[PDB]
Amino acid sequence: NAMNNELSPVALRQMSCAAGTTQTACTDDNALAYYNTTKGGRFVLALLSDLQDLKWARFPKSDGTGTIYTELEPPCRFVTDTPKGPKVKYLYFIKGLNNLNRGMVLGSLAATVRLQ
Amino acid sequence: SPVALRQMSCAAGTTQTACTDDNALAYYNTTKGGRFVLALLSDLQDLKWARFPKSDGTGTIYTELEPPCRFVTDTPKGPKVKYLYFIKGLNNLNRGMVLGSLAATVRLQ
């Protein structure tokens, strides 16, 4: 049968985390992060927040030895249909995220938040 | 752009003529008035082609499928194994959208 393809069991969850414009400006739960469940620590894909000018993000290490900081891409503006009126949110990509994982964020976003 | 993924049932098979009945589920995108099918989801490994009758009614359209990706979903009546086919020449971006939609909507193992 030629070759063999197999998709590993990967799941996309979300969690509250800190973010900001400076290294120190990252403070308690100002955004929501999209991450991947992988054995070699968590792989954060994108950030979703209500702020327009964010550059850094903090995450506690999976083992617990310390903290990690990640650079953010320029945000992508989009609108969600919220029952209490449409709300505008800002979506931040990881500074070095490839277009493949970018699509995963979009498919997960359209499935976890009400778009358009 | 703020894009949303919808799904529909369609026909597929191993040959051009083998595309019959309703043996697969397709992931498509709402673009302009038309539809952009991204991937195919079915319970068969034989699939190579997929057919759609044209909306106007002049004929039918066929699209070549990539080698399937095997995966297992947790269904209440026992785990079922499904095969996922991408459309020929799909860019890595739209590939993730199909994968991202599945990983957030279905429990795999």
PDB file of C-alpha atoms in Angstrom:
ATOM      1  CA  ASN A   1       0.000   0.000   0.000  1.00  0.00           C
ATOM      2  CA  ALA A   2       2.772   2.418  -1.033  1.00  0.00           C
ATOM      3  CA  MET A   3       3.455   4.459   2.124  1.00  0.00           C
ATOM      4  CA  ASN A   4       1.721   5.023   5.471  1.00  0.00           C
ATOM      5  CA  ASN A   5       0.332   8.277   6.868  1.00  0.00           C
ATOM      6  CA  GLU A   6      -0.686   8.678  10.506  1.00  0.00           C
ATOM      7  CA  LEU A   7      -1.825  11.792  12.366  1.00  0.00           C
ATOM      8  CA  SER A   8      -0.511  11.869  15.920  1.00  0.00           C
ATOM      9  CA  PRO A   9      -3.171  12.634  18.557  1.00  0.00           C
ATOM     10  CA  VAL A  10      -2.724  16.396  18.972  1.00  0.00           C
ATOM     11  CA  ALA A  11      -5.240  18.583  20.808  1.00  0.00           C
ATOM     12  CA  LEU A  12      -5.581  22.370  20.936  1.00  0.00           C
ATOM     13  CA  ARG A  13      -6.588  23.931  24.262  1.00  0.00           C
ATOM     14  CA  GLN A  14      -6.634  27.487  25.586  1.00  0.00           C
ATOM     15  CA  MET A  15      -5.484  29.060  28.844  1.00  0.00           C
ATOM     16  CA  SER A  16      -5.207  32.464  30.482  1.00  0.00           C
ATOM     17  CA  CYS A  17      -1.741  34.012  30.477  1.00  0.00           C
ATOM     18  CA  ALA A  18       0.137  37.297  30.779  1.00  0.00           C
ATOM     19  CA  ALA A  19       1.259  39.624  27.992  1.00  0.00           C
ATOM     20  CA  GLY A  20       2.450  43.167  27.448  1.00  0.00           C
ATOM     21  CA  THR A  21       4.540  45.592  25.423  1.00  0.00           C
ATOM     22  CA  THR A  22       7.735  45.348  27.510  1.00  0.00           C
ATOM     23  CA  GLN A  23       9.396  42.418  29.234  1.00  0.00           C
ATOM     24  CA  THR A  24       8.078  43.665  32.598  1.00  0.00           C
ATOM     25  CA  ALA A  25       4.663  44.841  31.321  1.00  0.00           C
ATOM     26  CA  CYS A  26       3.545  41.183  31.169  1.00  0.00           C
ATOM     27  CA  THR A  27       1.059  40.937  34.041  1.00  0.00           C
ATOM     28  CA  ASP A  28      -1.649  38.568  35.298  1.00  0.00           C
ATOM     29  CA  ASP A  29      -4.122  37.120  32.759  1.00  0.00           C
ATOM     30  CA  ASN A  30      -4.493  39.868  30.157  1.00  0.00           C
ATOM     31  CA  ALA A  31      -4.862  37.442  27.217  1.00  0.00           C
ATOM     32  CA  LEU A  32      -5.855  33.928  26.144  1.00  0.00           C
ATOM     33  CA  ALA A  33      -3.238  31.634  24.585  1.00  0.00           C
ATOM     34  CA  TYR A  34      -3.631  28.763  22.112  1.00  0.00           C
ATOM     35  CA  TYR A  35      -1.209  25.912  22.864  1.00  0.00           C
ATOM     36  CA  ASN A  36      -0.481  22.313  21.847  1.00  0.00           C
ATOM     37  CA  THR A  37      -0.275  19.251  24.111  1.00  0.00           C
ATOM     38  CA  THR A  38       3.235  17.895  23.461  1.00  0.00           C
ATOM     39  CA  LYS A  39       5.510  15.852  25.723  1.00  0.00           C
ATOM     40  CA  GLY A  40       8.481  18.196  25.308  1.00  0.00           C
ATOM     41  CA  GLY A  41       6.745  21.059  27.082  1.00  0.00           C
ATOM     42  CA  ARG A  42       3.800  23.087  25.873  1.00  0.00           C
ATOM     43  CA  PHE A  43       3.947  24.579  22.380  1.00  0.00           C
ATOM     44  CA  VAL A  44       2.082  27.894  22.395  1.00  0.00           C
ATOM     45  CA  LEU A  45       0.786  28.875  18.954  1.00  0.00           C
ATOM     46  CA  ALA A  46      -1.086  32.191  19.202  1.00  0.00           C
ATOM     47  CA  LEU A  47      -2.458  34.823  21.578  1.00  0.00           C
ATOM     48  CA  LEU A  48      -6.002  36.211  21.679  1.00  0.00           C
ATOM     49  CA  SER A  49      -6.729  39.354  23.682  1.00  0.00           C
ATOM     50  CA  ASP A  50      -8.708  42.603  23.811  1.00  0.00           C
ATOM     51  CA  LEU A  51      -5.621  44.793  23.308  1.00  0.00           C
ATOM     52  CA  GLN A  52      -4.169  46.310  20.148  1.00  0.00           C
ATOM     53  CA  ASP A  53      -0.471  46.784  21.068  1.00  0.00           C
ATOM     54  CA  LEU A  54       1.059  43.611  22.571  1.00  0.00           C
ATOM     55  CA  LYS A  55       4.560  42.269  21.970  1.00  0.00           C
ATOM     56  CA  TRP A  56       5.608  39.904  24.777  1.00  0.00           C
ATOM     57  CA  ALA A  57       3.977  36.970  26.559  1.00  0.00           C
ATOM     58  CA  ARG A  58       4.873  34.957  29.662  1.00  0.00           C
ATOM     59  CA  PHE A  59       4.245  31.275  30.375  1.00  0.00           C
ATOM     60  CA  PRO A  60       5.263  29.166  33.386  1.00  0.00           C
ATOM     61  CA  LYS A  61       7.449  26.241  32.366  1.00  0.00           C
ATOM     62  CA  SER A  62       5.783  22.847  32.028  1.00  0.00           C
ATOM     63  CA  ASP A  63       8.074  21.273  34.631  1.00  0.00           C
ATOM     64  CA  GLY A  64       7.949  24.327  36.905  1.00  0.00           C
ATOM     65  CA  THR A  65      11.600  25.425  36.995  1.00  0.00           C
ATOM     66  CA  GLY A  66      10.817  28.955  35.810  1.00  0.00           C
ATOM     67  CA  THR A  67       9.207  31.153  33.154  1.00  0.00           C
ATOM     68  CA  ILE A  68       9.431  31.574  29.382  1.00  0.00           C
ATOM     69  CA  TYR A  69       8.996  34.693  27.243  1.00  0.00           C
ATOM     70  CA  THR A  70       7.920  34.734  23.590  1.00  0.00           C
ATOM     71  CA  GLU A  71       7.913  37.498  20.982  1.00  0.00           C
ATOM     72  CA  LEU A  72       4.588  38.274  19.294  1.00  0.00           C
ATOM     73  CA  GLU A  73       3.743  39.129  15.694  1.00  0.00           C
ATOM     74  CA  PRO A  74       1.739  42.213  14.679  1.00  0.00           C
ATOM     75  CA  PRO A  75      -1.878  41.490  15.607  1.00  0.00           C
ATOM     76  CA  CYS A  76      -4.595  40.489  13.160  1.00  0.00           C
ATOM     77  CA  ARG A  77      -7.851  42.332  13.793  1.00  0.00           C
ATOM     78  CA  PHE A  78     -11.166  40.487  13.503  1.00  0.00           C
ATOM     79  CA  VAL A  79     -14.705  40.681  14.869  1.00  0.00           C
ATOM     80  CA  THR A  80     -16.632  38.126  16.920  1.00  0.00           C
ATOM     81  CA  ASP A  81     -20.410  37.811  17.204  1.00  0.00           C
ATOM     82  CA  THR A  82     -21.029  38.115  20.944  1.00  0.00           C
ATOM     83  CA  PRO A  83     -24.610  37.884  22.274  1.00  0.00           C
ATOM     84  CA  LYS A  84     -24.082  41.163  24.168  1.00  0.00           C
ATOM     85  CA  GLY A  85     -23.164  42.976  20.955  1.00  0.00           C
ATOM     86  CA  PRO A  86     -20.313  42.391  18.507  1.00  0.00           C
ATOM     87  CA  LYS A  87     -16.891  42.636  20.151  1.00  0.00           C
ATOM     88  CA  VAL A  88     -13.603  43.322  18.351  1.00  0.00           C
ATOM     89  CA  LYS A  89     -10.674  41.111  19.365  1.00  0.00           C
ATOM     90  CA  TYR A  90      -6.993  41.098  18.442  1.00  0.00           C
ATOM     91  CA  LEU A  91      -5.115  37.917  17.474  1.00  0.00           C
ATOM     92  CA  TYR A  92      -1.342  37.643  17.925  1.00  0.00           C
ATOM     93  CA  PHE A  93       0.849  35.060  16.210  1.00  0.00           C
ATOM     94  CA  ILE A  94       4.183  33.746  17.449  1.00  0.00           C
ATOM     95  CA  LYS A  95       7.080  35.709  15.951  1.00  0.00           C
ATOM     96  CA  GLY A  96       8.448  32.662  14.116  1.00  0.00           C
ATOM     97  CA  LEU A  97       5.279  30.667  13.485  1.00  0.00           C
ATOM     98  CA  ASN A  98       5.141  28.856  10.144  1.00  0.00           C
ATOM     99  CA  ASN A  99       2.068  29.102   7.922  1.00  0.00           C
ATOM    100  CA  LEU A 100       1.135  25.479   8.659  1.00  0.00           C
ATOM    101  CA  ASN A 101       0.633  26.030  12.390  1.00  0.00           C
ATOM    102  CA  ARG A 102      -0.937  29.384  11.474  1.00  0.00           C
ATOM    103  CA  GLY A 103      -3.804  27.545   9.789  1.00  0.00           C
ATOM    104  CA  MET A 104      -4.258  25.332  12.852  1.00  0.00           C
ATOM    105  CA  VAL A 105      -4.837  28.494  14.895  1.00  0.00           C
ATOM    106  CA  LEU A 106      -7.439  29.683  12.385  1.00  0.00           C
ATOM    107  CA  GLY A 107      -9.297  26.367  12.344  1.00  0.00           C
ATOM    108  CA  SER A 108      -9.184  26.178  16.138  1.00  0.00           C
ATOM    109  CA  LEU A 109     -10.256  29.818  16.469  1.00  0.00           C
ATOM    110  CA  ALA A 110     -13.269  29.399  14.183  1.00  0.00           C
ATOM    111  CA  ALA A 111     -14.239  26.363  16.287  1.00  0.00           C
ATOM    112  CA  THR A 112     -13.694  27.940  19.731  1.00  0.00           C
ATOM    113  CA  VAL A 113     -15.020  31.489  19.186  1.00  0.00           C
ATOM    114  CA  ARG A 114     -17.969  32.752  17.148  1.00  0.00           C
ATOM    115  CA  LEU A 115     -16.532  34.589  14.135  1.00  0.00           C
ATOM    116  CA  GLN A 116     -18.211  37.031  11.734  1.00  0.00           C
TER     117      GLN A 116
ATOM    118  CA  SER B   1      -9.218  37.069   7.028  1.00  0.00           C
ATOM    119  CA  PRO B   2     -11.986  35.844   9.356  1.00  0.00           C
ATOM    120  CA  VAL B   3     -12.764  32.524   7.660  1.00  0.00           C
ATOM    121  CA  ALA B   4     -15.132  29.805   8.901  1.00  0.00           C
ATOM    122  CA  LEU B   5     -15.164  26.128   7.913  1.00  0.00           C
ATOM    123  CA  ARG B   6     -18.350  24.280   6.946  1.00  0.00           C
ATOM    124  CA  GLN B   7     -18.858  20.656   5.932  1.00  0.00           C
ATOM    125  CA  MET B   8     -21.036  18.730   3.482  1.00  0.00           C
ATOM    126  CA  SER B   9     -21.584  15.173   2.268  1.00  0.00           C
ATOM    127  CA  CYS B  10     -20.269  14.253  -1.177  1.00  0.00           C
ATOM    128  CA  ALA B  11     -19.354  11.337  -3.433  1.00  0.00           C
ATOM    129  CA  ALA B  12     -15.912   9.804  -3.928  1.00  0.00           C
ATOM    130  CA  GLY B  13     -14.300   6.609  -5.111  1.00  0.00           C
ATOM    131  CA  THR B  14     -11.270   4.832  -6.500  1.00  0.00           C
ATOM    132  CA  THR B  15     -12.157   5.445 -10.142  1.00  0.00           C
ATOM    133  CA  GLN B  16     -13.886   8.314 -11.910  1.00  0.00           C
ATOM    134  CA  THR B  17     -16.960   6.071 -12.236  1.00  0.00           C
ATOM    135  CA  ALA B  18     -16.624   4.610  -8.714  1.00  0.00           C
ATOM    136  CA  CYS B  19     -17.682   7.994  -7.285  1.00  0.00           C
ATOM    137  CA  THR B  20     -21.197   6.991  -6.240  1.00  0.00           C
ATOM    138  CA  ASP B  21     -23.760   7.292  -3.416  1.00  0.00           C
ATOM    139  CA  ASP B  22     -22.629   9.314  -0.330  1.00  0.00           C
ATOM    140  CA  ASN B  23     -19.502   7.667   1.122  1.00  0.00           C
ATOM    141  CA  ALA B  24     -17.560  10.717   2.334  1.00  0.00           C
ATOM    142  CA  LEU B  25     -17.692  14.040   4.170  1.00  0.00           C
ATOM    143  CA  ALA B  26     -15.944  17.107   2.734  1.00  0.00           C
ATOM    144  CA  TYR B  27     -14.576  20.238   4.407  1.00  0.00           C
ATOM    145  CA  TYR B  28     -15.153  23.288   2.213  1.00  0.00           C
ATOM    146  CA  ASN B  29     -14.745  27.052   2.477  1.00  0.00           C
ATOM    147  CA  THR B  30     -17.322  29.758   1.757  1.00  0.00           C
ATOM    148  CA  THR B  31     -15.675  31.929  -0.907  1.00  0.00           C
ATOM    149  CA  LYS B  32     -17.531  34.325  -3.216  1.00  0.00           C
ATOM    150  CA  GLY B  33     -20.697  32.556  -4.352  1.00  0.00           C
ATOM    151  CA  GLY B  34     -18.813  29.328  -4.960  1.00  0.00           C
ATOM    152  CA  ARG B  35     -17.329  26.799  -2.568  1.00  0.00           C
ATOM    153  CA  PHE B  36     -13.668  25.843  -2.018  1.00  0.00           C
ATOM    154  CA  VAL B  37     -13.341  22.236  -0.847  1.00  0.00           C
ATOM    155  CA  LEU B  38     -10.242  21.707   1.311  1.00  0.00           C
ATOM    156  CA  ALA B  39     -10.176  18.078   2.453  1.00  0.00           C
ATOM    157  CA  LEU B  40     -12.109  14.809   2.408  1.00  0.00           C
ATOM    158  CA  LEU B  41     -13.080  12.755   5.461  1.00  0.00           C
ATOM    159  CA  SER B  42     -14.327   9.190   5.034  1.00  0.00           C
ATOM    160  CA  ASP B  43     -14.094   5.676   6.469  1.00  0.00           C
ATOM    161  CA  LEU B  44     -12.279   4.235   3.432  1.00  0.00           C
ATOM    162  CA  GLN B  45      -8.663   4.096   2.277  1.00  0.00           C
ATOM    163  CA  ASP B  46      -9.300   3.459  -1.441  1.00  0.00           C
ATOM    164  CA  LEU B  47     -10.172   7.044  -2.269  1.00  0.00           C
ATOM    165  CA  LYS B  48      -8.331   8.920  -5.015  1.00  0.00           C
ATOM    166  CA  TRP B  49     -11.008  11.067  -6.677  1.00  0.00           C
ATOM    167  CA  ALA B  50     -14.051  13.039  -5.529  1.00  0.00           C
ATOM    168  CA  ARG B  51     -17.034  14.267  -7.553  1.00  0.00           C
ATOM    169  CA  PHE B  52     -19.399  17.233  -7.214  1.00  0.00           C
ATOM    170  CA  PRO B  53     -22.190  18.108  -9.664  1.00  0.00           C
ATOM    171  CA  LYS B  54     -21.984  21.682 -10.889  1.00  0.00           C
ATOM    172  CA  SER B  55     -24.350  24.187  -9.293  1.00  0.00           C
ATOM    173  CA  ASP B  56     -25.540  25.477 -12.673  1.00  0.00           C
ATOM    174  CA  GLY B  57     -26.167  21.959 -13.985  1.00  0.00           C
ATOM    175  CA  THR B  58     -23.888  21.626 -17.017  1.00  0.00           C
ATOM    176  CA  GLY B  59     -22.033  18.640 -15.555  1.00  0.00           C
ATOM    177  CA  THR B  60     -19.820  17.333 -12.754  1.00  0.00           C
ATOM    178  CA  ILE B  61     -16.429  18.282 -11.315  1.00  0.00           C
ATOM    179  CA  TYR B  62     -13.648  15.923 -10.169  1.00  0.00           C
ATOM    180  CA  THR B  63     -10.693  16.663  -7.887  1.00  0.00           C
ATOM    181  CA  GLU B  64      -7.627  14.522  -7.232  1.00  0.00           C
ATOM    182  CA  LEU B  65      -6.972  13.423  -3.655  1.00  0.00           C
ATOM    183  CA  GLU B  66      -3.685  13.125  -1.788  1.00  0.00           C
ATOM    184  CA  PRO B  67      -2.641   9.958   0.080  1.00  0.00           C
ATOM    185  CA  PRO B  68      -4.905   9.600   3.129  1.00  0.00           C
ATOM    186  CA  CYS B  69      -3.924  10.290   6.734  1.00  0.00           C
ATOM    187  CA  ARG B  70      -5.058   7.590   9.143  1.00  0.00           C
ATOM    188  CA  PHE B  71      -6.469   8.674  12.489  1.00  0.00           C
ATOM    189  CA  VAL B  72      -8.852   7.450  15.177  1.00  0.00           C
ATOM    190  CA  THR B  73     -11.727   9.352  16.789  1.00  0.00           C
ATOM    191  CA  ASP B  74     -13.426   8.632  20.116  1.00  0.00           C
ATOM    192  CA  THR B  75     -17.100   7.990  19.198  1.00  0.00           C
ATOM    193  CA  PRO B  76     -19.633   7.017  21.895  1.00  0.00           C
ATOM    194  CA  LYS B  77     -20.183   3.619  20.221  1.00  0.00           C
ATOM    195  CA  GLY B  78     -16.484   2.730  20.333  1.00  0.00           C
ATOM    196  CA  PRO B  79     -13.445   4.302  18.673  1.00  0.00           C
ATOM    197  CA  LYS B  80     -13.777   4.547  14.894  1.00  0.00           C
ATOM    198  CA  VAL B  81     -10.855   4.881  12.478  1.00  0.00           C
ATOM    199  CA  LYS B  82     -11.225   7.568   9.809  1.00  0.00           C
ATOM    200  CA  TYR B  83      -9.089   8.567   6.825  1.00  0.00           C
ATOM    201  CA  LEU B  84      -8.443  12.199   5.886  1.00  0.00           C
ATOM    202  CA  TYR B  85      -7.720  13.203   2.277  1.00  0.00           C
ATOM    203  CA  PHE B  86      -6.411  16.614   1.278  1.00  0.00           C
ATOM    204  CA  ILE B  87      -7.258  18.233  -2.045  1.00  0.00           C
ATOM    205  CA  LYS B  88      -4.510  18.078  -4.672  1.00  0.00           C
ATOM    206  CA  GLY B  89      -2.144  21.010  -4.270  1.00  0.00           C
ATOM    207  CA  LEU B  90      -3.603  22.395  -1.049  1.00  0.00           C
ATOM    208  CA  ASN B  91      -1.284  24.951   0.520  1.00  0.00           C
ATOM    209  CA  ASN B  92       0.033  24.389   4.033  1.00  0.00           C
ATOM    210  CA  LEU B  93      -2.157  27.202   5.395  1.00  0.00           C
ATOM    211  CA  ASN B  94      -5.489  25.623   4.425  1.00  0.00           C
ATOM    212  CA  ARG B  95      -4.054  22.281   5.565  1.00  0.00           C
ATOM    213  CA  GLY B  96      -3.762  23.612   9.108  1.00  0.00           C
ATOM    214  CA  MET B  97      -7.308  24.978   9.043  1.00  0.00           C
ATOM    215  CA  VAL B  98      -8.597  21.452   8.401  1.00  0.00           C
ATOM    216  CA  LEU B  99      -6.275  20.052  11.074  1.00  0.00           C
ATOM    217  CA  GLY B 100      -6.976  22.867  13.530  1.00  0.00           C
ATOM    218  CA  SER B 101     -10.721  22.416  13.110  1.00  0.00           C
ATOM    219  CA  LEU B 102     -10.481  18.674  13.801  1.00  0.00           C
ATOM    220  CA  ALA B 103      -8.141  18.939  16.808  1.00  0.00           C
ATOM    221  CA  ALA B 104     -10.476  21.451  18.481  1.00  0.00           C
ATOM    222  CA  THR B 105     -13.756  19.671  17.642  1.00  0.00           C
ATOM    223  CA  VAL B 106     -12.952  15.936  17.941  1.00  0.00           C
ATOM    224  CA  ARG B 107     -11.281  13.822  20.639  1.00  0.00           C
ATOM    225  CA  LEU B 108      -8.456  11.859  19.007  1.00  0.00           C
ATOM    226  CA  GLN B 109      -6.268   9.194  20.593  1.00  0.00           C
TER     227      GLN B 109
END
